[PDB]
Design a protein around this nucleic acid. Structure first.
Ligand SMILES: [Mg+2]
Ligand SMILES: [Mg+2]
Ligand SMILES: [Mg+2]
Ligand SMILES: [Mg+2]
Ligand SMILES: [Mg+2]
Ligand SMILES: [Mg+2]
Ligand SMILES: [Mg+2]
Ligand SMILES: [Mg+2]
Ligand SMILES: [Mg+2]
Ligand SMILES: [Mg+2]
Ligand SMILES: [Mg+2]
Ligand SMILES: [Mg+2]
Ligand SMILES: [Mg+2]
Ligand SMILES: [Mg+2]
Ligand SMILES: [Mg+2]
Ligand SMILES: [Mg+2]
Ligand SMILES: [Mg+2]
Ligand SMILES: [Mg+2]
Ligand SMILES: [Mg+2]
Ligand SMILES: [Mg+2]
Ligand SMILES: [Mg+2]
Ligand SMILES: [Mg+2]
Ligand SMILES: [Mg+2]
Ligand SMILES: [Mg+2]
Ligand SMILES: [Mg+2]
Ligand SMILES: [Mg+2]
Ligand SMILES: [Mg+2]
Ligand SMILES: [Mg+2]
Ligand SMILES: [Mg+2]
Ligand SMILES: [Mg+2]
Ligand SMILES: [Mg+2]
Ligand SMILES: [Mg+2]
Ligand SMILES: [Mg+2]
Ligand SMILES: [Mg+2]
Ligand SMILES: [Mg+2]
Ligand SMILES: [Mg+2]
Ligand SMILES: [Mg+2]
Ligand SMILES: [Mg+2]
Ligand SMILES: [Mg+2]
Ligand SMILES: [Mg+2]
Ligand SMILES: [Mg+2]
Ligand SMILES: [Mg+2]
Ligand SMILES: [Mg+2]
Ligand SMILES: [Mg+2]
Ligand SMILES: [Mg+2]
Ligand SMILES: [Mg+2]
Ligand SMILES: [Mg+2]
Ligand SMILES: [Mg+2]
Ligand SMILES: [Mg+2]
Ligand SMILES: [Mg+2]
Ligand SMILES: [Mg+2]
Ligand SMILES: [Mg+2]
Ligand SMILES: [Mg+2]
Ligand SMILES: [Mg+2]
Ligand SMILES: [Mg+2]
Ligand SMILES: [Mg+2]
Ligand SMILES: [Mg+2]
Lengths: 271, 46, 93
RNA sequence: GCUCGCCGGAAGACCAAGGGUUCCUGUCCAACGUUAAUCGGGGCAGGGUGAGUCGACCCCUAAGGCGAGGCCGAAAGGCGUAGUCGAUGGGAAACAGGUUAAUAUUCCUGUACUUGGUGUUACUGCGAAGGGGGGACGGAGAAGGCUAUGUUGGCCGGGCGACGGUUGUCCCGGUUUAAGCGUGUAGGCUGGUUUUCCAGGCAAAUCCGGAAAAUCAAGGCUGAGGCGUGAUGACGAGGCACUACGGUGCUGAAGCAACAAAUGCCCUGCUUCCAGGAAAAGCCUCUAAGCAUCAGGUAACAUCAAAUCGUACCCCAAACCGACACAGGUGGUCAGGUAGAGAAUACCAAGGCGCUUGAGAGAACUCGGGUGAAGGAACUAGGCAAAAUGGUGCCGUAACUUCGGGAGAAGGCACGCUGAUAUGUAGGUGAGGUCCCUCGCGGAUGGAGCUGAAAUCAGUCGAAGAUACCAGCUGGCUGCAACUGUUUAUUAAAAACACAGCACUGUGCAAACACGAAAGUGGACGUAUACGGUGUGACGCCUGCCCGGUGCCGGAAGGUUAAUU
RNA sequence: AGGACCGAACCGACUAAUGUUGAAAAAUUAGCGGAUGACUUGUGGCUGGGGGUGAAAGGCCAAUCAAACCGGGAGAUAGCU
């Protein structure tokens, strides 16, 4: 559900919120919860290594099963849940032997639905199979890059991967970026799209809403002095130079990928 | 107004105390310099 | 059991003041100066063995030595321990 | 000592931090104290800090620190594993009265509570470094039940008034009591019990999770406050006998109800929202190795233990941070009366103070204020400053608008006191009595007593009734920035910065990028609906032409071209 | 409901006067802005000098900042006074 707030105050005028009625209103499953304090973008030297990070709401980490390696035990979806740590929603599933787990909730999945993993799983959304057993043309998500490592590709809200080809031991995947990549056919994938496709229709509306998510203000380079940015300086608004990062690398079109180890797997760049 | 010195005994001992000096070779060199000068008070400890 | 040598060492002096005398009268309590490291149990055992009276409780405090200016030089008297020894209402030490 | 004045959400009281004897007593007045000093936070001397329950220490962890081995690095060293530290957080237990010149939840009196070690008895499956439950957690809002507390009445004791009245519907004062134990309430959550089974909880489990049936329909957990006991005790206004005038001591009445009522408690509750809200131990439970009539566990009684350290005093300040006995700064708690929406404000209570130079005079001028004829911005860079407006209820309110606003637009009327309605109304609170039952801190009825707005009418005083304190000036046109925010600590608060939104661009995850000779770390326990960089800056309508120059992206025929040979 | 409204505590600092060998090496008085939030505050911790940190003023990093402080090279050099 996408609903616009009424302009009863200037900070509310442009707010557009995503409210999902189905989401659980209670507390999360306690044994599947771990704490994680914030870093502020600071590394173990105590230096800011990533700017514009800090503050925001306290969050508990939910242990999500990206591996999906209970083969042959059917599971039932108990309830959808809000996960602060990611854009997608998650589903708390109960296994027939009494094990409870969190999974990425695919589009369409709801309470009472059955899911299953393994080679003999039925082709239906939320089921996990090796891509050997998944037909060419299927839409999948939570794609493994190595067998047994856990899904790593297409995990954000509303994303998915298209299985384009299958030759030998490798499948050709079409990624959200447009890149065509090769991954091993033993790698597991989950049928269907990631849910919460309406997540991109949100409008924060005010600066405080970005602050609630741990995002600190960005200061433009041209607004500062030359001592601390190549864009700095000037009597009035002056630029006269090719745009660069704070460290001097050109930031409009220059390419930065340098990985000859994984170049063999890239069928075509995203263009 | 609020001034620069705002005393805390715990912070004082953790910053300049005897154990803090002993924990690094540079602090041990501070202690050697102060012993060689003949200082009655080596650190802020007491 | 605490050793006899320790008991002979712990007790130092009886404290003489009007508060101590009021303790002796009102509450049958003697006030002593003891060693800085003399515990309550050692004080009780030493009073019983060395003053031959029955004790039911001792109370202790540490007195901080004062700072005194003697000939413009700065000095500090030593800290000492003081004991309030209650005799169990039948002794009259 | 008697008056006077000042603070009283503090200028009173208690703490933490910080200080360290400044605390109390005697004595002294050189120096110190912005003057004197007989006085002092000054000199000198003596005295003073009493704990199983308060805190530390202790058990347990957060951020973070250190870190055996380890990985890395010319050396020095960096990071990090197992671990081990680290509160600002979790974890056993005490209250009231009395007492010193100076301590007291520590001493004394009374009445309690916690944990541990032993000893005996009786029953008996005990046991972890492991499994599980629990601890255990956000913001906002609403209502009910309470209590602290206050007011009035009743009750007790005392009074009969320096000037007209004051035996009464008069005046003054008191009317207090804890923890614990018993009760299990207003209320909150949740269906129980019993069989059998199981791809789960690293092994196991009767424990937790799941599955299938029977049976019953009330069980369990939590819970302020009240009541009873504690307590025939203590305290108590006042009386009495001495005084060192400070006080010593004896006795000591009544000690009830109603009403109002928190920002405190029930409540870590309930409702709701999105930004989705510590950890670990104590604690309960389950077993494994193991022991296996032993040990150990449980229940009762006895008895012993609870150490050490802190404890004086200041603590919005003359004792801390400011070189000062300095108009500065400094976290938490307590929270009376009248009026008031109020922790504003005025006047007061408890309590605390008059700020460590005074005495005169009554010039100019300076500072801070009061009032002002006639005029009313003529002043000036500029209405700077000042003057003015100011409350509640009701009526009434334009352009424009993103339909929310604009708006308290503007403007206007009423406003005190007395009586009546109504010997106190509508409402709120609620006793006695009666009726019922799964019988009590129960249900229903009944409404005495108490408390008590708003309105209308009539009358009445003053120049003036939101009378003091307190408490919006309003309107028209226009530049800039959408807006709330941020900034040059100490001459600039803005049109500057940020901002939601927009766009370009990079990035396929051992991501790009950043900090690092490195190992690693952040990005992120994220995965293109993501993350970084850059510019623009809500929203509406839009965003034209140029790739010659510079940059970037792509291409590789040809020219040129390094080490090398 | 709200980076909603009026307004104390609390956080700030727009105007004026005083003060300028100050009561004060940045305050006082009267007015002024925010006041449930991008709020404010206590305790503890981390980031170190061509480095940090910065809603960006070359601001801030112990009354010191277009390169902190302390010690050292060091009696730097000074065609200048
Ligand atoms: Mg960024
Ligand atoms: Mg931005
Ligand atoms: Mg600038
Ligand atoms: Mg440059
Ligand atoms: Mg220009
Ligand atoms: Mg130009
Ligand atoms: Mg002294
Ligand atoms: Mg004194
Ligand atoms: Mg004299
Ligand atoms: Mg003098
Ligand atoms: Mg003195
Ligand atoms: Mg003690
Ligand atoms: Mg005792
Ligand atoms: Mg840690
Ligand atoms: Mg080592
Ligand atoms: Mg380390
Ligand atoms: Mg520890
Ligand atoms: Mg603590
Ligand atoms: Mg005292
Ligand atoms: Mg009451
Ligand atoms: Mg409040
Ligand atoms: Mg005290
Ligand atoms: Mg003075
Ligand atoms: Mg002062
Ligand atoms: Mg303050
Ligand atoms: Mg006031
Ligand atoms: Mg007054
Ligand atoms: Mg005059
Ligand atoms: Mg004048
Ligand atoms: Mg005037
Ligand atoms: Mg006039
Ligand atoms: Mg006139
Ligand atoms: Mg006029
Ligand atoms: Mg003019
Ligand atoms: Mg003129
Ligand atoms: Mg003005
Ligand atoms: Mg005025
Ligand atoms: Mg113009
Ligand atoms: Mg603006
Ligand atoms: Mg503003
Ligand atoms: Mg500021
Ligand atoms: Mg300035
Ligand atoms: Mg300014
Ligand atoms: Mg990584
Ligand atoms: Mg701009
Ligand atoms: Mg613009
Ligand atoms: Mg253009
Ligand atoms: Mg507001
Ligand atoms: Mg405003
Ligand atoms: Mg002011
Ligand atoms: Mg306001
Ligand atoms: Mg500049
Ligand atoms: Mg400075
Ligand atoms: Mg330099
Ligand atoms: Mg040289
Ligand atoms: Mg020289
Ligand atoms: Mg020359």
């Amino acid at each position: 559900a996408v609903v616009k707030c009424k302009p009863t105050s200037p900070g509310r005028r442009h707010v557009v919120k995503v409210v999902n009625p189905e989401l659980h209103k209670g507390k999360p499953f306690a044994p599947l919860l771990e704490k994680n304090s914030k870093s502020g973008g600071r590394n173990n030297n105590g230096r800011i290594t990533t700017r514009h990070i800090g503050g925001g709401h306290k969050q508990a980490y939910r242990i999500v099963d990206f591996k999906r390696n209970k083969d042959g035990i059917p599971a039932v979806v108990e309830r959808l849940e809000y996960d602060p740590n990611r854009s997608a929603n998650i589903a708390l599933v109960l296994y027939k032997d009494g094990e409870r787990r969190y999974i990425l909730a695919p589009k369409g999945l709801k309470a009472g639905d059955q899911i299953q993993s393994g080679v003999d799983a039925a082709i239906k959304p939320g089921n996990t199979l090796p891509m050997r057993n998944i037909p060419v043309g299927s839409t999948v998500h939570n794609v493994e890059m190595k067998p047994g490592k856990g899904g790593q590709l297409a995990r954000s809200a509303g994303t998915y991967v298209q299985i384009v080809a299958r030759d030998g031991a490798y499948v050709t995947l079409r990624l959200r970026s447009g890149e065509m990549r090769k991954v091993e056919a033993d790698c597991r994938a989950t049928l269907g799209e990631v849910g919460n496709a309406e997540h991109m229709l949100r409008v924060l509306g005010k600066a405080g809403a970005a602050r609630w998510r741990g995002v600190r203000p960005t200061v433009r380079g041209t607004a500062m002095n030359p001592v601390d940015h190549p864009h700095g300086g000037g009597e009035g608004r002056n630029f006269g130079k090719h745009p660069v990062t704070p460290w001097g690398v050109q930031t409009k079109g220059k390419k930065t990928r340098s990985n000859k180890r994984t170049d063999k797997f890239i069928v075509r760049r995203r263009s | 107004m609020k001034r620069t010195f705002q005393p805390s005994v715990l912070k004082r001992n953790r910053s300049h105390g005897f154990r803090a000096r002993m924990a690094t070779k540079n602090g041990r060199q501070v202690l050697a310099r102060r012993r060689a000068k003949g200082r009655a008070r080596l650190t802020v400890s007491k | 059991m605490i050793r006899e040598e320790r008991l002979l060492k712990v007790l130092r002096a009886p404290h003489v003041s009007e508060k101590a005398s009021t303790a002796m009268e009102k509450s049958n309590t003697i006030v002593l100066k003891v060693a800085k490291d003399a515990t309550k149990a050692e004080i009780k055992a030493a009073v019983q063995k060395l003053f031959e009276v029955e004790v039911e409780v001792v109370n202790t405090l540490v007195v901080k030595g004062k700072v005194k200016r003697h000939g413009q030089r700065i000095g500090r008297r030593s800290d000492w321990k003081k004991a309030y020894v209650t005799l169990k209402e039948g002794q009259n030490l």
